Design a protein around this ligand. Structure first.
Ligand code: CU
Ligand code: CU
Lengths: 287, 286
């Protein structure tokens, strides 16, 4: 419990110019791509083969898989600049605005704005605008520039609300059988957004649109990591208030989903990442 | 060093049965599938994006990437049965047969045989025959059964020969710019099989056919690992003949290809797996 992680809205200007600069360095060095690829790779590892569950989504491991992913990413940030931690995008509060698109998390000094509808929704403002930031597709080849299209779908016109988050936090069980999108009374499935969906996580992806709207390719947008830090924060909060609850399934879920199974593409297990402060970080709202 | 990887032809019946049994356990457990997936994932990781080099093939990291892969695989075998090590298929010796398909490697108590023509070359003999061994496709779903067609293509009608291997072993440089399929006078490119191809490695994949003939999905056939153990063995031989030669490139190559770059999907570097006897194994010959 040392490295913090702060609300994007509470970050000094200097902190943002430094976060963005560090992300650009990781991209230049070839490291950022590894994260895009890892995510896509996990999506093709079905547990078991033929199931809709995969190593990183639509099943128990969703939360610890992303925790590990962010942890590795934050370590790579810190190897460049030890003062840089991963911030979180508190979307539930942005949802309160008339036009969430006006949030400072899209400012030209940070993540840049919505896509330009005249350009096939290509982001042309901010540090990740086309020409300054190249994306890759699922073959692993350059794919022409970041796209975003806020709230453009009928299923996800708006971001999740504070009440949506509070309601998820009331759920007592981490997950329930059959450990997939049909799980009910499950914190995991609720937060992932498949109970009467899309809700929460799944809704944020859909709301942002562009690369974020396609799960495999989503990490092409740096906001992906901000989004997931918020998901991780919500989980950490759930763990704090439900101290006697533990990860499920403990055993006899599909291989890759159990407490002590390795999470492809790594050897890391859910047990390894259950306690976030032991990992070396904390969320501001804890302090 | 004292894990000993043996020629398939020098394995006892018991060693063969134990190897097979262990591979089937790994598959049942869900672990084998991690190896298929890793391979596929590295194939989609281009170094740099847009080029025809990838993390595991058609570039300098081809050899160390596969050495790491096999090392992880053998450690998984060992965790099931501590006596099992990864054997190697010395194809260059089978190439001397009148009919290589009669090699003991394709025994009904080891890898099983060639595919059946009237069942569209589905393997119906051995421990990995259809109904006893499922395969997965590039997308990670079930794809219906192991298939093999020995020597069916015009470009690779035969296995590489002893002289093919000897000639590769004479090359003085590990690799050369631009560190890709077009590299000349490079041991890596010669062994991988792209100098006047397809020869050696690439030739073996093409000769076996079926899943083996398609690089990403190749792992689906257990003989993949025995083939790569032979490739690793041949590299280890080269490393001793040219003991004053080291991995290349050392710096200014694409990220993921240099001596101290991590090899996607892992953090392991080529430096890490340079010396194989520091990794805990040797080949019987040595
Ligand atoms: Cu994801
Ligand atoms: Cu390969």
């Amino acid at each position: 419990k040392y490295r913090v992680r702060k609300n994007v809205l509470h970050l000094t200007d200097t902190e943002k110019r430094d976060f963005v600069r560090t992300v650009l360095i990781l991209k230049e060095k070839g490291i950022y791509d590894r994260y895009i690829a890892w995510h896509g790779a996990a999506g093709k590892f079905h547990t078991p083969p033929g199931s809709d569950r995969n190593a990183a989504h639509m099943s128990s491991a969703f939360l610890p898989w992303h925790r590990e992913y962010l942890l590795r990413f934050e370590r790579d940030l810190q190897s460049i600049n030890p003062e840089v931690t991963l911030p979180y995008w508190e979307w539930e509060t942005d949802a309160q605005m008339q036009d969430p698109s006006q949030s400072q998390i899209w400012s030209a000094d940070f993540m840049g704005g919505n896509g330009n509808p005249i350009k096939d929704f290509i982001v042309d403002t901010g540090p990740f605008a086309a020409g300054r930031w190249t994306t890759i597709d699922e073959q692993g080849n350059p794919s022409g520039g970041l796209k975003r299209n806020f709230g453009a779908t009928k299923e996800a016109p708006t971001l999740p609300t504070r009440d949506d988050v509070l309601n998820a936090l009331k759920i007592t069980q981490y997950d329930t059988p059959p450990w997939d999108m049909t799980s009910q009374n499950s914190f995991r499935n609720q937060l992932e957004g498949f109970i009467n969906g899309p809700q929460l996580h799944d809704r944020v992806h859909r709301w942002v649109g562009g690369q974020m709207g396609v799960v495999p390719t989503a990490p092409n947008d740096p906001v992906f990591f901000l989004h997931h830090a918020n998901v991780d924060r919500i989980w950490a909060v759930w763990q704090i208030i439900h101290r006697n609850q533990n990860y499920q399934p403990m055993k006899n879920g599909p291989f890759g989903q159990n407490f002590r199974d390795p999470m492809y593409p790594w050897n890391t297990t859910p047990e390894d990442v259950m306690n976030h402060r032991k990992l070396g970080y904390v969320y501001d709202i804890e302090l």
